Every structure is written in structure tokens, then in C-alpha cells.
Design a protein around this ligand. Sequence first.
Ligand SMILES: *[C@@H]1O[C@H](CO[C@@H]2O[C@@H](C)[C@@H](O)[C@@H](O)[C@@H]2O)[C@@H](O[C@@H]2O[C@H](CO)[C@@H](O[C@@H]3O[C@H](CO[C@H]4O[C@H](CO)[C@@H](O)[C@H](O)[C@@H]4O[C@@H]4O[C@H](CO)[C@@H](O[C@@H]5O[C@H](CO)[C@H](O)[C@H](O)[C@H]5O)[C@H](O)[C@H]4NC(C)=O)[C@@H](O)[C@H](O[C@H]4O[C@H](CO)[C@@H](O)[C@H](O)[C@@H]4O[C@@H]4O[C@H](CO)[C@@H](O)[C@H](O)[C@H]4NC(C)=O)[C@@H]3O)[C@H](O)[C@H]2NC(C)=O)[C@H](O)[C@H]1NC(C)=O
Ligand SMILES: *[C@@H]1O[C@H](CO[C@@H]2O[C@@H](C)[C@@H](O)[C@@H](O)[C@@H]2O)[C@@H](O[C@@H]2O[C@H](CO)[C@@H](O[C@@H]3O[C@H](CO[C@H]4O[C@H](CO)[C@@H](O)[C@H](O)[C@@H]4O[C@@H]4O[C@H](CO)[C@@H](O[C@@H]5O[C@H](CO)[C@H](O)[C@H](O)[C@H]5O)[C@H](O)[C@H]4NC(C)=O)[C@@H](O)[C@H](O[C@H]4O[C@H](CO)[C@@H](O)[C@H](O)[C@@H]4O[C@@H]4O[C@H](CO)[C@@H](O)[C@H](O)[C@H]4NC(C)=O)[C@@H]3O)[C@H](O)[C@H]2NC(C)=O)[C@H](O)[C@H]1NC(C)=O
Lengths: 209, 210
Amino acid sequence: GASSVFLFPPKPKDTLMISRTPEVTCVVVDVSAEDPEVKFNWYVDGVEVHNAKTKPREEQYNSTYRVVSVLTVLHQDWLNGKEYKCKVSNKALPSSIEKTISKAKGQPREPQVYTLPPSRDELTKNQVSLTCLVKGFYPSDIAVEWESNGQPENNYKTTPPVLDSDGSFFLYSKLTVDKSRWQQGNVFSCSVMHEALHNHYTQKSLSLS
Amino acid sequence: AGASSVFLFPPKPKDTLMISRTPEVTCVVVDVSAEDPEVKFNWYVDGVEVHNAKTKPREEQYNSTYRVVSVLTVLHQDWLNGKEYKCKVSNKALPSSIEKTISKAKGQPREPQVYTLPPSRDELTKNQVSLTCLVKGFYPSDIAVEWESNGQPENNYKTTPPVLDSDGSFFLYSKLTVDKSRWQQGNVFSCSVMHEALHNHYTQKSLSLS
Ligand SMILES: *[C@@H]1O[C@H](CO[C@@H]2O[C@@H](C)[C@@H](O)[C@@H](O)[C@@H]2O)[C@@H](O[C@@H]2O[C@H](CO)[C@@H](O[C@@H]3O[C@H](CO[C@H]4O[C@H](CO)[C@@H](O)[C@H](O)[C@@H]4O[C@@H]4O[C@H](CO)[C@@H](O[C@@H]5O[C@H](CO)[C@H](O)[C@H](O)[C@H]5O)[C@H](O)[C@H]4NC(C)=O)[C@@H](O)[C@H](O[C@H]4O[C@H](CO)[C@@H](O)[C@H](O)[C@@H]4O[C@@H]4O[C@H](CO)[C@@H](O)[C@H](O)[C@H]4NC(C)=O)[C@@H]3O)[C@H](O)[C@H]2NC(C)=O)[C@H](O)[C@H]1NC(C)=O
Ligand SMILES: *[C@@H]1O[C@H](CO[C@@H]2O[C@@H](C)[C@@H](O)[C@@H](O)[C@@H]2O)[C@@H](O[C@@H]2O[C@H](CO)[C@@H](O[C@@H]3O[C@H](CO[C@H]4O[C@H](CO)[C@@H](O)[C@H](O)[C@@H]4O[C@@H]4O[C@H](CO)[C@@H](O[C@@H]5O[C@H](CO)[C@H](O)[C@H](O)[C@H]5O)[C@H](O)[C@H]4NC(C)=O)[C@@H](O)[C@H](O[C@H]4O[C@H](CO)[C@@H](O)[C@H](O)[C@@H]4O[C@@H]4O[C@H](CO)[C@@H](O)[C@H](O)[C@H]4NC(C)=O)[C@@H]3O)[C@H](O)[C@H]2NC(C)=O)[C@H](O)[C@H]1NC(C)=O
């Protein structure tokens, strides 16, 4: 079952902040109740490692079992482009199944962050859209958040990264707020974390002009 | 049993929304063996067999298999009214036929609101600047967005995929990049949006230096 095994990268924020602990996560589903202990082998740049913490089989709501293995990774290892391999050996199956993941290769490029106030035409509405354009970044791993008065905002959506014509990525984040909060002069801030920004962080603000 | 080797693709949104354009449904069969006899296609529209499809000759792939494509031209009205298109792929080498079906997304259509946004003040120090088109509140997600200036298509734009918003509708952004000099001259730029819930399937918003 080369499709019962899933390997997840660390969160973008986790690899960029010293206070956080990035992990790669190997998930195997559909283990039968009659199957023996599923084995995980982990490799970093081809070298086997043994510090993974594997979760005892958890019974599911569809009668199957799930096994999750978690490997903590070093911030710099991930950022320096090391390859993480997860190999899952379920003896009830013919074959072991391997997956590999790593940071995309290529010169990192610094995001340029721009905030855009609502379109004049939208000011007629009950709620208005505050836009954060983030462009020119590489690789596509990035975190974007909105806040106001030191507090996280409740209502925003961010597009996936989109490949631009010069080989870098862009995205937009759309924050929706009541027109009243906008008219009252509240300051809103889009913060962005990416490996190619100084301090891995930058913020741009937006308020009624 | 070959079931995962047949793929059925819808027409492009723009093609279904403009009568002058030709919308097509495309049935693609991959992993066709050289030892297989002729792959055969039958096509149906709401269960009724149709005969106007054009099937291309098999094309050799670098992995020693063939790809075979059949293309069915559809009426705009038919697609937009939700008729079902079925491609049935037959091959003596297989025990059973493989059938795939496709149709337009269901659910109440909602009209997009289109907003143009000028470059951020901070971007005006760059030699290239970004003109933004925000399109929101639409359903279904099938939509086309383009940019023009002086009646000519612009080259350098990219558009995000539709993103599901908190109310069940979709939004996207389209980003047009232009030389800062063209923006500063006062040239007018237009974002045009095609969607089935718009009057005449078309609307546009313009943007220039202010
Ligand atoms: C029996 O039950 C279990 C449990 O199911 C759950 O419970 C029931 C009640 C249902 O409600 C069900 O919906 C629930 O999911 C079933 O197990 C499930 O099995 C399916 C497959 O059958 C799995 O589906 C795949 O999911 C992938 C993504 O999963 C994530 O996102 C979904 C939501 O989108 C979540 O629900 C998942 O749990 C996953 O969530 C992610 O989890 C990560 C690990 O924890 C998180 O990362 C970590 O987070 C921590 C802290 O949070 C740290 O930060 C760590 O650092 C970090 O690593 C992550 O944040 C989290 N994300 C989110 C958003 O929450 C899909 O990607 C995948 O699609 C691929 O594969 C498909 C083939 O199956 C294919 O169709 C797709 O196209 C895609 O294909 C891939 O394409 C790429 C590139 O093109 C290729 O490179 C790949 O090769 C290719 N894939 C291939 C070849 O396989 C699947 O859709 C599902 O995840 C799983 N659930 C759980 C919980 O394990 C089981 O199936 C049931 N049996 C039945 C029904 O018979
Ligand atoms: C041997 O080789 C062949 C050929 O590959 C090529 O050669 C080899 C040697 C390599 O060099 C390789 O790199 C080359 O590409 C291999 O054939 C491939 O087989 C795989 C399957 O194994 C196919 O994978 C599916 O791809 C779908 C997307 O395909 C499009 O997008 C890719 C780019 O991302 C293109 O490469 C494709 O050609 C398709 O491109 C589209 O083509 C349309 C038809 O022409 C275009 O539409 C038309 O456009 C014209 C204009 O030109 C008009 O506008 C018409 O009106 C319009 O109709 C369209 O524009 C174009 N798009 C793009 C972006 O280019 C995926 O959708 C699909 O995913 C489904 O299936 C998976 C299961 O396999 C599943 O995991 C997914 O989740 C998803 O599941 C489906 O989900 C839907 C709903 O979401 C359900 O309804 C379905 O039921 C469900 N199906 C399931 C579960 O099965 C696959 O990933 C691949 O497309 C194909 N390549 C080619 C070129 O045909 C072959 O595999 C090799 N064999 C071996 C043994 O190695």
C-alpha cells in the first residue's frame, strides 16, 4: 500500500523560531487489527537515526489502526536542505514503503510585503477587505498572520503560494473586518515569517488614511 | 482494472461562457499497452449516445506505453444546464469497460464582486509594480480572469486558484505586473472577469494612476 503512508514536513514557523521544535511526521493508516508491530526506519541524508518517537497503534472509528511516528529535526538541518526518509515495514504486506521530504532547492529570495487598503468601491459594504500581498519569495515555505492592537484577527484567508513568471512565489492574504473598525482608525498588521527575511520576520501595517 | 488509467477533463470556464469559443470535454486513456488491441470510446450525454467526438491516434510515451485521447465538443447551454457527460473506454484486453462521468459543479450560483487595487505606496520604489484584482463572493469556483490595456491583452499576470471563503463562496486574486513607468504615465488597465452568474457572463473594472 504505497498510498497508506504519509510524510509531513515541519511547520514553516517551527523551522524559523528558536523557541519552537520542528518535526517531520510519518503517518501510516489502514493497519489491520491482525497485523503485527509496524516498524519505522528513519534516515537523515541516508544515515539511519533512532531518536524518532513512535506512537503505539491507535484504533480508529472505521475499525482500522493508525500509527504515527514523529521525528524532531534540527532547525538548521531542515534549512540547510537535508533529506528526511521514512520507511514503513508492515510484515502483512509484500513491500516496505519509503517516502522522502526536504526543503526545496534553489537560492532563497526575500519576500516583499505590501498591504493594500479596501477598494473605494468596497467601502459601501458592511465588511471590507484588507489585503496583504507577499511576493518574490523562495522557497515557498512561509507563514502569514494578521493582528490588531496586539491581538490576532478572527477572519482571514490566505491563498496558496503561486509560481510567478520569474521563478519566485507570491500569495495574498485577505483579512475581513467590519467597516466600522476600519473607519475608527484601527491599525491592522500583516506579519510574515520566511527564512530569507532578516530575523526571519517582518510586519507591515495598514490603517485608514 | 484500468479504472485508474482513464481521466476525464471538463471544458475551460472561459470556453463555456463565450459562445464564440469551443468548449470540449476530453477523455484521456494512459498506460495503453502495445500488445492491446484498439482502444474504443463511446460518449453519452445524459445517458444518450452521441457520435460527434474526435479521437486522436495513439501517441507513444517514453515509458513504452501509449496515450489515447478522445475530444467531445459540447454545447455551452448544455454544460451550463448541468448535463452529464460520460466517456466509456473499451478494450478487448480488459474484462470490463471503464466509464467516467463529469458535469458542472452544482449548487446555487453567486455573482462575484470585482475590486481593483493600486500598488502599495511602498512598492512605488520598484521598477515593476503590482496591480491587483480581487474577485470575491462567487459560486461555483469556475471562473476566468484576464487583464487588458488599450484593448490589448497584458502579458505578465498570474492568478491565484479559487480559495474557499468563510461563507461558502470563493475568492481569488489576480496580480498584473507592469513597468512602473507605464503606471506613472496614466495608462489605464482593466481586469475582466467571466463567470456564469454575471450578466452576459462578463464584467470588468479599470485601474489607473490617481
Ligand atoms: C479510517 O480512519 C482513518 C482516520 O481518518 C479520519 O477519521 C475519519 C472519522 C474521517 O473523518 C477521515 O476523514 C479522517 O481523516 C483514515 O485515515 C486517513 O486516510 C486518508 C487516506 O485514505 C488520509 O488522506 C490523506 O491525507 C493527506 C493530508 O492529510 C492531512 O490533512 C488532512 C486534512 O486535509 C488531515 O485530516 C490529516 O490528518 C493530515 O493532517 C495533517 O497531519 C500532519 C501530521 O500530524 C500535520 O503535520 C504535523 O503537525 C504537527 C502538529 O500539528 C507538527 O506541526 C508537525 O511538524 C507536522 O509535521 C498537518 O498539520 C496536518 N494538516 C492539516 C491540514 O490538518 C493528503 O495529502 C493525501 O492526499 C495525497 O494522497 C492521496 C492518495 O491517498 C491523493 O489522492 C492526493 O492527490 C495526494 O497525492 C499525493 O500527491 C503528492 C504531490 O502531488 C505526491 O508527492 C504524493 O506521492 C501523492 N500521494 C500518494 C502517492 O499517496 C490523502 O488524502 C488521511 O490523512 C488519514 N487520516 C488520518 C487522521 O490519518 C483511514 O483512511 C480510514 N479508512 C477508511 C475510511 O477506509
Ligand atoms: C507513462 O507516461 C504517461 C505519460 O506521462 C508523460 O510521459 C512520462 C513518460 C513522463 O515523462 C511524464 O512526466 C509525462 O507526463 C503517464 O500518464 C500519466 O498518468 C497519470 C496517472 O498515473 C496521470 O495523472 C493524473 O493527472 C491528472 C491531471 O492531468 C492533467 O494535468 C497534468 C499536469 O499536472 C498533465 O500532465 C495532464 O496531461 C493533464 O493535463 C490536462 O489535460 C487536459 C486534457 O487534454 C486539459 O484539458 C483540456 O484542455 C484543452 C486545451 O489544451 C481544452 O481546454 C479542453 O477543453 C480541456 O478538456 C488540461 O488543460 C490539462 N491540464 C494541465 C494542468 O495541463 C490528475 O487529475 C489525476 O489525479 C486524479 O487521479 C489520481 C489517481 O491516479 C488521484 O490520486 C487524484 O487525487 C485524482 O483523483 C481523481 O479525482 C477526481 C476528482 O478530483 C475524480 O473525479 C476521479 O475519479 C479521480 N481519479 C482517480 C481516483 O483515479 C492524475 O494524477 C497523468 O495525467 C498522465 N499524464 C499524461 C500526460 O496523460 C503514465 O502514468 C506513465 N505510466 C507509467 C506506468 O509510468
